[PDB]
Ligand binder design. Structure first.
Ligand SMILES: O=C(O)C[C@H](C(=O)O)N1C(=O)/C(=C2/C(=O)Nc3ccc(Br)cc32)SC1=S
Ligand SMILES: O=C(O)C[C@H](C(=O)O)N1C(=O)/C(=C2/C(=O)Nc3ccc(Br)cc32)SC1=S
Ligand SMILES: O=C(O)C[C@H](C(=O)O)N1C(=O)/C(=C2/C(=O)Nc3ccc(Br)cc32)SC1=S
Ligand SMILES: CC(=O)NS(=O)(=O)c1ccc(Br)cc1
Ligand SMILES: CC(=O)NS(=O)(=O)c1ccc(Br)cc1
Lengths: 122, 122
């Protein structure tokens, strides 16, 4: 059997995030009513069922700008975008409802599950 | 502090690899003598110093085809591309030399070290 590098996935992830913070190869701008977020489409698709369906759409595949539902709050989206790239979720009793609703919309099932844990713990 | 999802990086990587095997959003063809490999530039850049330097070159940035040193054997490159996307390295006394040299060329330092320990072990 293959040697298994248990640290490889999170090294790739950390470099993807360094790519993003230096804006290298980012190929999409996510629009949330007024606010803008630069990302890599494959990372978005690897993290969210919604992005998977969007960029798997023959029509929408080649857009450089994607509008999401403009009722999404942008803070909740921002928290979720940093999570995608860092595996770290900034959850608090001050944002929990916003972040959870945005994760449901984005179809990020692990995050919605942990949000249910957090509600039940506090 | 932020809740840490210790399984996130590896679920992203497993979906990046499902994207690859369905050919979704692959945006580069790697040419290895005669053989062709499809991949996503950001994953190559996240995993290899060589691809980091290639796709960060303003001149080579937008190329859909990358030709590598024709002296690289394709089997050693193929094992290393699967590793990037799965974290599993198929190393054996039958390919160790090819894999190690291709890892050095691609500037994948963690793989190179492991190969060194594999040599030391047998
Ligand atoms: O069986 C199917 O046809 C796929 C099935 C679906 O959409 O019907 N599915 C997915 O592929 C989902 C994905 C996801 O959330 N991130 C991802 C990254 C790469 C790939 Br390929 C898929 C997903 S969620 C879902 S259901
Ligand atoms: O082409 C683009 O720039 C964006 C693209 C589209 O319409 O093809 N798009 C949307 O507008 C999307 C929405 C969504 O998911 N929920 C929503 C609620 C209200 C409104 Br108005 C829009 C959406 S998802 C998507 S892709
Ligand atoms: O100091 C610097 O400017 C960076 C330094 C360099 O090129 O001089 N360096 C890198 O950024 C290297 C990377 C790599 O192998 N995969 C990667 C993914 C994302 C990012 Br950002 C970097 C790498 S290897 C290297 S040396
Ligand atoms: C779900 C996750 O990433 N981690 S966790 O299981 O350790 C967890 C975190 C916070 C609360 Br409150 C309850 C559980
Ligand atoms: C410290 C630890 O074991 N895990 S953790 O960092 O993911 C964490 C869990 C719950 C909260 Br509430 C805040 C942090």
């Amino acid at each position: 059997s293959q040697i298994q590098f248990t640290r490889h996935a999170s090294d790739v992830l950390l470099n993807l995030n360094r790519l993003r913070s230096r804006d290298i190869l980012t190929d999409v701008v996510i629009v949330v009513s007024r606010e803008q977020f630069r990302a890599h489409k494959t990372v978005l698709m690897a993290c969210s069922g919604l992005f998977y369906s969007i960029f798997t759409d023959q029509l929408k595949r080649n857009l450089s700008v994607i509008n999401l539902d403009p009722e999404i709050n942008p803070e909740g989206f921002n928290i979720l975008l940093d999570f995608m790239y860092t595996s770290r979720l900034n959850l608090r009793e001050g944002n929990i409802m916003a972040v959870m609703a945005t994760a449901m919309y984005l179809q990020m099932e692990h995050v919605v599950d942990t949000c249910r844990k957090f509600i039940k713990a506090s």
